[PDB]
Design a binder for this molecule. Structure first.
Ligand SMILES: O=c1c(O)c(-c2ccc(O)c(O)c2)oc2cc(O)cc(O)c12
Ligand SMILES: [Zn+2]
Length: 227
């Protein structure tokens, strides 16, 4: 891992980097939230934001420093502070933000800024290409009601890497995490859906755990199978 200011960066693939944002919570400590940075030719594609806009701006700094390429668009997993904490930073930079239709509807309620674009999903969970213009390797898939009712997952086409967001947990986890607005009935079903959508993905990257194997999906489903 490479320390960069208040954040940590790590390379997973020759064109896929992972960022880690830390939120200082008195009494608990530092909560880490991961994200993905993929390079597509001469453009950069970012998945999710940091805990805060400031930290998100720090990511943009790293991108401009190491990659030196402009960000085409940014896709978030859900309307939560741990993934949509840097919406203003993106808008201030002029980066097009893409989020789920439900996320943009729940964002204002959660106290977050809705994205500029709304992703529409099919009955199979797959994203509608119409609302996904020039996404490239960013394949979006909506598993269903899990961590939230607006959570989505993104797979990096051209690589065996998939992002489980805050839905999927690591194979060494003991808890599912924040189950406040989570669906205790479709959690396992949704978790398994993601695994079926991307069965070739060996590296499952999440937001609160370091990139795990496919065992993370099964583990999450097995834990959610007890709800
Ligand atoms: O992802 C989240 C997260 O990690 C925590 C968190 C984790 C451990 C703690 O001990 C704690 O107090 C909070 O906050 C959250 C609050 C939300 O509304 C939604 C989230 O997704 C998170
Ligand atoms: Zn969340």
């Amino acid at each position: 891992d490479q320390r960069f200011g208040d954040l940590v960066f790590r390379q997973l693939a020759p064109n896929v980097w992972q960022h880690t944002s830390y939120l200082d919570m008195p009494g608990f400590g530092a909560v880490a939230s991961n994200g993905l940075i993929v390079r597509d030719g001469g453009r950069v594609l970012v998945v999710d934001t940091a805990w805060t806009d400031d930290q998100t701006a720090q990511i943009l700094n790293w991108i401009k420093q190491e990659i030196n390429l402009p960000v085409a668009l940014a896709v978030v997993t859900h309307a939560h502070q741990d993934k949509m904490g840097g919406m203003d930073a993106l808008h201030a930079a002029g980066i097009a933000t893409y989020a789920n239709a439900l996320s943009n509807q729940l964002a204002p309620q959660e106290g977050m800024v809705a994205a500029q674009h709304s992703l529409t999903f099919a009955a199979n969970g797959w994203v509608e290409p119409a609302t996904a213009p020039n996404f490239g390797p960013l394949k979006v898939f909506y598993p269903g009601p899990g961590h939230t009712s607006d959570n989505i997952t993104v797979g990096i086409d051209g690589t065996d890497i998939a992002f489980g967001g805050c839905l999927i947990k690591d194979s060494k986890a003991k808890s599912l995490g924040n189950l406040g607005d989570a669906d205790t009935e479709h959690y396992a079903a949704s978790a398994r859906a993601f695994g079926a959508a991307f069965p070739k993905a060996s590296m499952i990257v999440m937001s609160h755990s370091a990139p795990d194997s496919r065992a993370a999906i099964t583990h999450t489903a097995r834990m959610a199978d007890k709800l």
